[PDB]
Design an enzyme around this catalytic site. Structure first.
Site, PDB file in Angstrom:
ATOM      1  N   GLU A   1       0.308  -1.550   0.047  1.00 39.62           N
ATOM      2  CA  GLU A   1      -0.193  -0.317  -0.269  1.00 39.62           C
ATOM      3  C   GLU A   1       1.129   1.062  -0.257  1.00 39.62           C
ATOM      4  O   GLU A   1       0.295   2.063   0.545  1.00 39.62           O
ATOM      5  CB  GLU A   1      -1.204   0.014   0.684  1.00 39.62           C
ATOM      6  CG  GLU A   1      -2.167  -0.965   0.793  1.00 39.62           C
ATOM      7  CD  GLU A   1      -3.474  -1.784   2.078  1.00 39.62           C
ATOM      8  OE1 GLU A   1      -4.371  -2.163   1.629  1.00 39.62           O
ATOM      9  OE2 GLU A   1      -2.868  -1.285   3.293  1.00 39.62           O
TER      10      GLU A   1
ATOM     11  N   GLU B   1      -4.184 -10.484  -1.093  1.00 38.50           N
ATOM     12  CA  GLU B   1      -5.490 -10.505  -0.249  1.00 38.50           C
ATOM     13  C   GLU B   1      -6.617 -10.715  -0.487  1.00 38.50           C
ATOM     14  O   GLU B   1      -6.908 -10.340  -1.803  1.00 38.50           O
ATOM     15  CB  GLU B   1      -4.992  -9.086   0.618  1.00 38.50           C
ATOM     16  CG  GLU B   1      -3.731  -8.462   0.607  1.00 38.50           C
ATOM     17  CD  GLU B   1      -3.708  -6.936   1.848  1.00 38.50           C
ATOM     18  OE1 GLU B   1      -4.501  -6.954   2.265  1.00 38.50           O
ATOM     19  OE2 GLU B   1      -2.403  -6.439   1.779  1.00 38.50           O
TER      20      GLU B   1
END
Ligand code: NA
Ligand code: NA
Ligand code: NA
Ligand code: NA
Lengths: 211, 211
Positions: free
Chosen positions: A69, A145
Site C-alpha cells: 500500500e 489479500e
C-alpha cells in the site's frame, strides 16, 4: 520481514512464503507521494536490499514482495529490477498502484471479486476472471489479500475456490488474515478481556478494524 | 459463398460479413479424413481461392472462413496461409479441430457456453470466459455459432450478452440460425403445410433438425 525463526520453521514444516519489504506509506496523499520521490529511494532500497541479503537462502521464500500500500512510484520500478538482477530465482510481486503495474510479475490484487468488477478510477479491481484476459495481459493472478475475515465473515469463500479450480491462471491467494490483533486488558477484578482500538485512550483510532 | 447480390446488399445496407468457403466434410470419420489428405488439397484450394478472387472487393466482407465442420487437417493450414499472403486486409477464421488451431486468427467455437466447461477429449468447448485466459492465449473470441434457436429456444441468451459486454476480448458471435429450413407441401384440399425431414420419403433423415 519476519522474525528469523519463522523462515526456518516454514522451511522445515513446509510452507510457501512471500517475503515482504517493510515499506508502507498508506496515509500519504496520493499514496505514492514518497515512493515516486527520488529522495526516498535510498531509505526504500535499504528495506528491500537488506531483506534479500538476509533471506535469500531460505527455500520457503518463493516470492519477493516490494511492500504494501504505497501506490506505484518509480522507486518501485527501480527496486523491482534490482531484485530481478540479483536474484532471478524468485518472482517479484507488488500490489500498489493497480496490482498489474510494471513492478510485479504476478497480478496480485487485494479484494478483487470473482465475478463483480469494481471500476474505481485509476486503480480498478476487475473481476479476477476478467482481469486475466484483458488485452495483452499474460501474467498469473494470485490475490495478495482476499476474503476479509472481519468478525462474522468469509461469505462467498466457495466462489473463489470454484474459480481458482476452473481457471489455470487463477492460482489462489492469501486470506486476510490469520489472527485478530486484539490485546489483553484487565477489569477491576483482575479478569482478562479482549481490547481493540480506542481501549488504551488511543485517539484517533480505528476501533475493531484490527480484528 | 452466397448469391453475388447478397454481398452488394450487405455493402449498401451495412452488415459485416463472414465469407465462407464451400467446404464441409462433417460425416467423415474422423472429421479431417479428407482435409488432412494432400490428394484433396487441389479441390479444397479451388473452393477457397475462387471465393477470395470473387469477393475480395466487397467492403462488407470483413472475415474469410475456411469452411465448416471438416476437422483440422494440414490442407487448412496451407489455405489459411494462402489467404494471409494474398489478402492481408482481412482476418481468417475456421472452427474445425477445436476452434483455436493454427488455422484461425479468431477463437471461434460453436455452442461454447458462458460459464460451463464441456471438456470433450481432443476438441473441448471451454467456457468462453475461461478460454480467453488459457495459458498463452491472446486471440479475440467470437462464436461462429451460438444460442441454437431450435423450436422453443434461446433460453440463457442474456447470459451471453452480459459476458460479451463485460469482457473486452469476448466480441460477440453469430446465432444459429436465421431461418427455419422447412418446405411447403400440400394436403388433399390443396392447403400448404410446413414440412421437414422425412416428409418427402427421404430416408434416412434427421427430421426437424433442419428448423
Ligand atoms: Na487455477
Ligand atoms: Na485491519
Ligand atoms: Na466484449
Ligand atoms: Na440444423
Amino acid at each position: 520481514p519476519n522474525h528469523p525463526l519463522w523462515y526456518t520453521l516454514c522451511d522445515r514444516y513446509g510452507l510457501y512464503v512471500v517475503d515482504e519489504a517493510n515499506i508502507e506509506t498508506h496515509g500519504m496523499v496520493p499514496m505514492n507521494r514518497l515512493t515516486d520521490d527520488p529522495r526516498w529511494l535510498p531509505a526504500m532500497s535499504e528495506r528491500v536490499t537488506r531483506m534479500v541479503q538476509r533471506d535469500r537462502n531460505h527455500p520457503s521464500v518463493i516470492i519477493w514482495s516490494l511492500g504494501s500500500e504505497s501506490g506505484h512510484g518509480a522507486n518501485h520500478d527501480a527496486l523491482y529490477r534490482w531484485i530481478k538482477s540479483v536474484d532471478p530465482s524468485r518472482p517479484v510481486q507488488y500490489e500498489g498502484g493497480g496490482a498489474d503495474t510494471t513492478a510485479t510479475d504476478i497480478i496480485c490484487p487485494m479484494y478483487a471479486r470473482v465475478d463483480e468488477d469494481q471500476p474505481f478510477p485509476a486503480v480498478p479491481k476487475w473481476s479476477i476472471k476478467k482481469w486475466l484476459s484483458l488485452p495483452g495481459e499474460t501474467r498469473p493472478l494470485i490475490l495478495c489479500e482476499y476474503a476479509h475475515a472481519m468478525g462474522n465473515s468469509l461469505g462467498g469463500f466457495a466462489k473463489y475456490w470454484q474459480a481458482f479450480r476452473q481457471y489455470p491462471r487463477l492460482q489462489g491467494g492469501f486470506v486476510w488474515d490469520w489472527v485478530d490483533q486484539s490485546l489483553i486488558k484487565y477489569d477491576e477484578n483482575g479478569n482478562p478481556w479482549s481490547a481493540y482500538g480506542g481501549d488504551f485512550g488511543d485517539t484517533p483510532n480505528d476501533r475493531q478494524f484490527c480484528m
